[PDB]
Structure formats: structure tokens, C-alpha cells
Ligand binder design. Structure first.
Ligand SMILES: Nc1nnc(-c2ccc(O)cc2)s1
Length: 281
């Protein structure tokens, strides 16, 4: 069923809350035993948001390999994403270790450091060229190279250095700065513009490790970003773009991380973004 018609049918009937609960009811349930170990309690931002054991990212160290991060592997679309939480004061070194080990080119950030008067994630990148950051626990150095500030997003060039080998890599930081404190954006136009800027960079392409995507919990806004991207790629691989079922794509993605899309308003916004983006695809 053409999703644009399914959309008007749900909207006219006001059944967004009913569709969303059906998804929550059918979603996969897999163990997260490593996330709930007592040694990991200070590695988790939210008690109710954990990575499944089968899909979790492992840090390459014998001490403790745990980070709140999942590999979402979309087989038909041929795209992979790492979804993670906003880093904590004691996990900023783990975060950059993961970026290094997984060979990521891009980091996508969909939140502000402060929202609703509370801290949603650590200040995990340098704000001035001449004041670099050193992570002593993971032996990494991070330098701000340049910054391009626009109306809806900021793009930063960073240099990450493995102090152990003196190898360096260029990381691009794509920071969407205008998602509102409550609700979802009114138009998907600036979110779609942002997504196509990330694509243009090469960050989502198979010659690199998976893109790292985060918000505060790494399931709501982060879920919207990967669902829209995968749906638009599929609408292009299929003889009948109309065969793309956004609810079936979301349940597939929920096999890899729990809770993707946190509200009925985020589900509706995801439909809007894909409907509007398809008009350019
Ligand atoms: N009426 C139409 N159905 N499909 C179209 C299409 C699909 C993929 C593209 O890359 C460009 C155009 S137009």
C-alpha cells in the first residue's frame, strides 16, 4: 500500500498511537546480560536502554569490552550503522576508541549538550583549534581542524590520532542543532537536507566502517535518521518503490537495538520525511 495513502488514512482516523503500540507489541526481545553486569552500571546513561548481546559493539581491550552501542546491519539496503548513547563523562575515551577500532569516517549528533535545562551528553570534542583533547585511558588525541556553522546544522573536521602508533585519520562531525526540546520538527525539509549532506560526504559508503549515530539515549532521533535513510535507499533498489513498508523496516531494525522510535509523533515524522524525500529520489 503506497505509504502516502496509508499516511492520510492514519491521519484522518487519528490512529498514530494505535499503530505505534502494535510495533512495540511485535518488536523483538533478546538478552542484554553484558549491559546489566554490575561493573557496567556507570557505562549506561538510562537503566531501560541497553544493547542486545548478539549485536553489541565490543571494545578491543581485555579489561572490559563493554560500550552502550549496537551494529544495525540492513542486508537488502547494503547499509550498516552504529547507534550509541550520548557519551558520559567516564565513557568519552571508550567512544573515540570505538570510532578508531570500527574505522568510521563520520559521527552524526542529533542533540544539544544541554536541553530542557539538563545535560544530555558530555562535551566530547574540542571547541577551539589550539585546545586539543587527550583521552589518557584509551591513548587517543583529538584536534578541531575547522568548523562550518549553518542555520540548521554544523559540520566539523576533526583529527583523531592513535598515540600508540602515531597514525591519524580525518573524522567528520555532522551536528544537527535545531531539533526542538519538545515534539518533532514541523517540516522534514531541514532533516532531509542534513541527511543528504551526510551521504555526500562518503561517511555512509561501504569503503569506510559504519557511521556512528547518537542522540541522548541513541534510539529516538537516532532511529529516525537510519529508518529514513534505509527506506529511501530501498525505494531505489525495488522495481516498485511502493513495496517499501516503513513498519516492516522498523521491526527489522528493532531486531538489532531495542526501542528505535520513542513516540507516535517520531513515527509520523519518519513517514513525512520518507514521503517528502522520495520526491527527490
Ligand atoms: N514514477 C516513477 N517511479 N520511479 C521513479 C524513479 C526511481 C528511481 C530513480 O533513481 C529515479 C526515478 S519515477
Amino acid at each position: 500500500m503506497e505509504m502516502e495513502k496509508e499516511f492520510e488514512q492514519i491521519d484522518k482516523s487519528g490512529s498514530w498511537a494505535a499503530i505505534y503500540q502494535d510495533i512495540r507489541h511485535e518488536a523483538s526481545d533478546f538478552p542484554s546480560r553484558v549491559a546489566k553486569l554490575p561493573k557496567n552500571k556507570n557505562r549506561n546513561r538510562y537503566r531501560d536502554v541497553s544493547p542486545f548481546d548478539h549485536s553489541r559493539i565490543k571494545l578491543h581491550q581485555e579489561d572490559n569490552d563493554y560500550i552502550n552501542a549496537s551494529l544495525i546491519k540492513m542486508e537488502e539496503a547494503q547499509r550498516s550503522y552504529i547507534l550509541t548513547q550520548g557519551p558520559l563523562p567516564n565513557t568519552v575515551g571508550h567512544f573515540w576508541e570505538m570510532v578508531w577500532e570500527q574505522k568510521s569516517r563520520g559521527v552524526v549528533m542529533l542533540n544539544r549538550v544541554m536541553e530542557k535545562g539538563s545535560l544530555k551528553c558530555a562535551q566530547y570534542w574540542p571547541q577551539k583549534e589550539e585546545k586539543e583533547m587527550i583521552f589518557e585511558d584509551t591513548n587517543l588525541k583529538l584536534t578541531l581542524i575547522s568548523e562550518d556553522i549553518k542555520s540548521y546544522y554544523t559540520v566539523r573536521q576533526l583529527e583523531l590520532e592513535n598515540l600508540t602508533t602515531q597514525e591519524t585519520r580525518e573524522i567528520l562531525h555532522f551536528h544537527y542543532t535545531t531539533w526542538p526540546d519538545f515534539g518533532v520538527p514541523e517540516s522534514p525539509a531541514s532533516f532531509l537536507n542534513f541527511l543528504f549532506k551526510v551521504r555526500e560526504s562518503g561517511s555512509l559508503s561501504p569503503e569506510h566502517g559504519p557511521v556512528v549515530v547518537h542522540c541522548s539515549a541513541g534510539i529516538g532521533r537516532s532511529g529516525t535518521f537510519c529508518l529514513a535513510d534505509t527506506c529511501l535507499l530501498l525505494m531505489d533498489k525495488r522495481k516498485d518503490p511502493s513495496s517499501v513498508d516503513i513498519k516492516k523496516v522498523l521491526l527489522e531494525m528493532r531486531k538489532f537495538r531495542m526501542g528505535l522510535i520513542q513516540t507516535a509523533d517520531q513515527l509520523r515524522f519518519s513517514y513525512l520525511a520518507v514521503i517528502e524525500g522520495a520526491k527527490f529520489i
